[PDB]
Amino acid sequence: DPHTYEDPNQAVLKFTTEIHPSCVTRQKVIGAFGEVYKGMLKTEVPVAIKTLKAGYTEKQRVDFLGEAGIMGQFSHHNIIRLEGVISKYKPMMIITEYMENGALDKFLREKDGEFSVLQLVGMLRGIAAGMKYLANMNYVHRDLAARNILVNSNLVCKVSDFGKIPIRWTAPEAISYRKFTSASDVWSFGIVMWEVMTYGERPYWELSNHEVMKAINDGFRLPTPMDCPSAIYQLMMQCWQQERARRPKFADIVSILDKLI
Template sequence: MQPDAYNSRVPRSVGPKIPFVSTPKSRTYVDPHTYEDPNEAIREFAKEIDVSFITIEEVIGGGEFGDVCKGKFRIPAMNIEKDVAIKTLKPDGGDKARSDMLAEASIMGQFDDPNIVSLEGVVTRSNPIMIVTEYMRNGSLDKFLQQNDGMFTILQLIGMMRGVASGMVYLSHISFVHRDLAARNILVNENLVCKVSDFGLSRELEMDRSDYTTKGGKIPVRWTAPEAISYRKFTSASDVWSFGVVMWEILTYGERPYWNWSNQDVIKAVEEGFRLPPTMNYCPKILYQLMLDCWRVERSERPKFIEIVNRLDNLSRNPYLMEDGIALSAIDIDPDHYISPSDLLTVEEWLRSLNLERYTNVFISNGYTQVCHCLPLNHEHLLGLGIVSAVHRKKMLDSLRSPDGYIV
């Protein structure tokens, strides 16, 4: 969807609607992997669809099991036809791929929440096997933001965060841990409603335990809490950590967390206390504080998802609370910020004067072209740029302190 077309339906001046977050019925998620026969789980949790009711129109992507297509689902009893997304199993997928695909459908079939992608049903009695879900016109959140960089108000961005958090309230209430919460696994519909999807890495949170311990397997390091990386312990609290990273992705319009760092560099930095810095564009301090709360080392100190929803709702109703944000890219034209002549130096001139010109390309490639752009930086920001030498960071920050007392 083109940004102009989107904005004609969702005016930039209008804040997000705030729906009520309902508490799910008193029930607990059942892990389909506990069934000896995956077909039994499918029969219990998913509806079988006659393949004649499905029409595949076009391939829109590729998934773990096969193609992802857009199509139509005809419902004769209601005399309607709706757009759907269709995941198909590769002809040579094998028994394990079939079992995994049916397990994912059995997981989705247990969910019923407006911020979770809904399952329409499955096709298992003919080939290819299909999972049929609601169609989300704008695709994954990360790509949607990248394609519409800078197009939304802060209230609209908060509305996206709120939708994700609301879906996670539901999942946590039914004792389900996602394990792979990231912007790439959030889908967006034509009304900017964000819904949690992709449950391939998910596992249940057993009622008589406070955590779930995996036995190996891939972990999305950039989104994963330290205790989940170190000890393979996944809880709703580790999902909260991941949500903080999703907030950062939303505010950066889909930037890659920790940039081009290796996974080992990310793990080491986080263990040493590094956290993703405030985003380059407008980042209210109160939102960044919520991110930091999600990234607390002690998982018991992280907020619950219902608390996150309440805090985001409070910001939506009281946007003045975000007036302390700093637009880093506009600091050089802010009339309330004093700029000395030295601040108008280019970054190249400044670094050369410090004998640190080796970092010139690092700063320029990240949008810092003048010294005035660097005034809000602190040690965490510089470390985020890849300046690992504490001596060099101190030298840079000391040089940014003017006689008038900039606090950096």
């Protein structure tokens, strides 16, 4: 093994392609850790470009580049594509494919009421296909939420982002015992289904994180969204079983949604 000894800032680059700075053009800021730009990549394709905020430590630099390193391990229709990274130069950049419709939760809020049930279920199916791929790769995500899904022009949804925890989206056993598995991702997927079917309502509304923690252990579950088919809500309820072994697996979820479509 030539990599018995390795610098962590090199280890995280393994599944990435190094891109020369002359190949990349940032054109405008589209989001704001650090900033997100819309740009072009000469390979000319449109891309999203993430940079790291000035003053970062080496640890933050490794964590930043490691995001690209995780993304680069994956190749699936419903997982955001990594074009490459600029790591040898400043500012450092993570270059990914451009997604015209931005984050799923924001998208649904802006297009509220505008999709058919079939289109919404199609989005959920793509997310589920992405998560089945991750689960099969033995990757436990821990932050599955509509804000971490990107949407392109064809409404294809891709998982795009890879102890503070996202309390509203996290399974009870993970909040209580830090027990994160694919089955806790399944719980999160149930929350995402609810975010989708309500067109981007915040899970548990204005309830505080503490009220949510208490509610879910008391057996409270989010109620059916308006106009949500009962089979869709029933699947949500299965994803939110208190006993994680009772939740369906992602392969089961994909099959269930396919039969619905």
